[PDB]
């Protein structure tokens, strides 16, 4: 182990004894006096101080943000809407632990590190799709909806949220307001909407708007009913995206840890880094005053930015130690003061 020793070199040049300063108060006294014998008396060997127990942080408050993840009627898959968010903190902690969220899959960012980095802009994409194509929403694969309604780029970043709507979209009479396309001449580019509902033209025949035979209407209707089982239920899917390195950072979530008292801890009250014990005090600040000083410019009190409470700060216990020994002549017992 790494410690401090006092080696005794003889006239011959070979060490013949040693003492370990970390064993006993007597050994500490021997090291302090740099000798192997101590006479009767009281000696001040060192000084002790209680170590800090933990750390706390106190920062200001946050944004509220609810509306996009719970609305009345979500937009269709072929007419998905987008939202713009700026100059407000993104508290994703409330959504990470929420109960009825079923799907959380992404690749660009870590599932738990999304709040440790700061972004610039936030884009929210909201639509409703059947539960069969939840796997299909990932970029890379093709087919229905993924190529005809909503396509994602290969370098897409961000995490999407999907949840069931068993008791919020099912109707006994039947709902058909949710539409999707199965016939498109070209391929949809990533992050592109298709709103035109022109009838499909198949090679030939004069159905170029006549809407007759050998031509089908591309926008078909969904089949959304309590008699349906797993696989046909409508799933609400929201897609979050962002861009970086094109503007100053504006949107990102907040530490603001819990407050503890009556023990020497490390505190950070909007700065003012230090270590000490926190106790309630009767001192009365002015509204604009944050912290107070005693004689000789010593931090006596501080105001918690969260609850505006008045806290008295004093250093935790410290002091010197003294070892009472009757001398190595008689015995080796010691007492500590």
């Amino acid at each position, epitope marked *: 182990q790494p410690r401090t020793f006092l080696l005794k070199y003889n006239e011959n040049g070979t060490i013949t004894d040693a003492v370990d300063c970390a064993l006993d108060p007597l050994s500490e006294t021997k090291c302090t006096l740099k000798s192997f014998t101590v006479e009767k008396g009281i000696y001040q060997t060192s000084n002790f101080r209680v170590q800090p127990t933990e750390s706390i942080v106190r920062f200001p408050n946050l944004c509220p943000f609810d509306e996009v993840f719970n609305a009345t009627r979500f937009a269709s898959v072929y007419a998905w*809407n987008r939202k713009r968010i700026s100059n407000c903190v993104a508290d994703y902690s409330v959504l990470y632990n929420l109960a009825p969220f079923f799907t959380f899959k992404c690749y660009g960012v870590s599932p738990t590190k999304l709040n440790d980095l700061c972004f610039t802009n936030v884009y929210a994409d909201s639509f409703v799709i059947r539960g069969d194509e939840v796997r299909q929403i990932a970029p890379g694969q093709t087919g229905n909806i993924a190529d005809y309604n909503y396509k994602l780029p290969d370098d897409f970043t961000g995490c999407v949220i999907a949840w069931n709507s068993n008791k919020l979209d099912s109707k006994v009479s039947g709902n058909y307001n949710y539409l999707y396309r199965l016939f498109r001449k070209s391929n949809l580019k990533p992050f592109e909407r298709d709103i035109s509902t022109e009838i499909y033209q198949a090679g030939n025949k004069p159905c170029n708007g006549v809407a007759g035979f050998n031509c089908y209407f591309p926008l078909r209707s969904y089949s959304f009913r309590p008699t349906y089982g797993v696989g046909h239920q409508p799933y609400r899917v929201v897609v979050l995206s962002f861009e970086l390195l094109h503007a100053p950072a504006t949107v990102c979530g907040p530490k603001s840890t819990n407050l503890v008292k009556n023990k020497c801890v490390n505190f950070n009250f909007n700065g003012l880094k230090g270590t000490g014990v926190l106790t309630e005090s009767n001192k009365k600040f002015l509204p604009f005053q944050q912290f107070g000083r005693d004689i000789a410019d010593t931090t006596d009190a501080v105001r918690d930015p969260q609850t505006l409470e008045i806290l008295d700060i004093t250093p935790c216990s410290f002091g010197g130690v003294s070892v009472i020994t009757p001398g190595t002549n008689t015995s080796n017992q010691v007492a500590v003061l």
Partner: antibody
Amino acid sequence: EVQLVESGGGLVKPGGSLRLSCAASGFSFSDAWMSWVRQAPGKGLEWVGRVSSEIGGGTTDYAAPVKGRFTISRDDSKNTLFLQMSSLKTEDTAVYYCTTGVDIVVMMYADDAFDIWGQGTMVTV
Amino acid sequence: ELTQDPAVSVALGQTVRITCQGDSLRSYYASWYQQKPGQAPVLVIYGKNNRPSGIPDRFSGSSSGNTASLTITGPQAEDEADYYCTSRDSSGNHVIFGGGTKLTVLG
């Protein structure tokens, strides 16, 4: 798919009221974003306002020079747009176009791209 | 408030550059529209660098900080029209439009 037709407009005394009708068909009308644009004769295009869609909240915006004095609305049942004008001025002599913001574009921005336009109508005050 | 030159004089077979100056062009990338004389404006250049379907591969757009540029390769006699740049402001989120520019043919 797409045809946009403009109705209304003409000669009217200052301070009167006039309503412009724009009808669109062939594309889906509740779930798209419209906008209004004007252009003085011999000058550039000038913004008028926006109506947006009810899927996401009504956030009908207006241009700064004509804020408050113009009324906009959307009626998805009859697929018609009504634009009501009040407290007309001598500088309102221009042509008005009803423009669909997005038909086929990569948006990645606010829902405003001005893909397809209309023929426009002439109004004089 | 976007600023554009009044008119551009480029001969046939030469690259035509159309500029649009604005303070907030770092974000809200500008969109370019072409308005024929006595005709409704049409979309030519939008998004990052692409164009709507049906537009011939002759117009390309680029941006650098607070400057937006339009490039024309192999100009014909039917391109004589007005070009407008449209951007967005951060606060009001308005289209504001631009002052436009005039392009002619030196044939």
